[PDB]
């Protein structure tokens, strides 16, 4: 993991699985949430990684999908 950047780690992780959570990316990278969010946000502005809230077990959690139309995210969720 250390050999790759946090950008590479997230993108490759989301390449393996279309959508992951911040907590799952946290465990994957072992990086800080804020630091990962910086990468996710900068990629989000580039239209690379998209975000959507999903209600689960009485609580809403935000998850991130790679190369997934935001419109489609709204339709699916």
Domains of the chain, residue spans: 1-77
Residue 32 CB partners (closer than 8 Å, separation 6+): 26
Contacts of 25 by beta carbon, 8 Å cutoff, 6+ apart: 9, 10, 13, 36, 40, 64
Taking the mean position of all CA atoms in its chain, how far away is CA 10?
Answer: 7
55 strand-pairing partners = 60
Is there a contact between 7 and 43 (Cβ–Cβ < 8 Å)?
yes
Q: Name beta bridge partners: 20.
A: 64
Instruction: Judge contact between 65 and 19, C-beta under 8 A.
Output: yes
Instruction: Return the CATH number of the domain spanning residue range 1-77.
Output: 1.10.10.10
3-state SS, the chain, equals: CCCCCHHHHHHHHHHHCCEEEHHHHHHHHCCCHHHHHHHHHHHHHCCCEEEEEEEECCEEEEEEEECCCHHHHHHHC
């Amino acid at each position: 993991k250390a050999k790759l950047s946090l950008t590479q780690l997230i993108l490759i992780r989301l390449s393996n699985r279309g959508c992951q959570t911040l907590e799952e990316l946290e465990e994957f990278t072992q990086a800080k949430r804020e630091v990962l969010l910086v990468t996710l946000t900068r990629l989000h502005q580039r239209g690379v990684i998209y975000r959507k809230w999903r209600h689960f077990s009485g609580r809403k959690y935000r998850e991130y999908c790679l190369k997934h139309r935001d419109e489609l995210a709204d339709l699916e969720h």
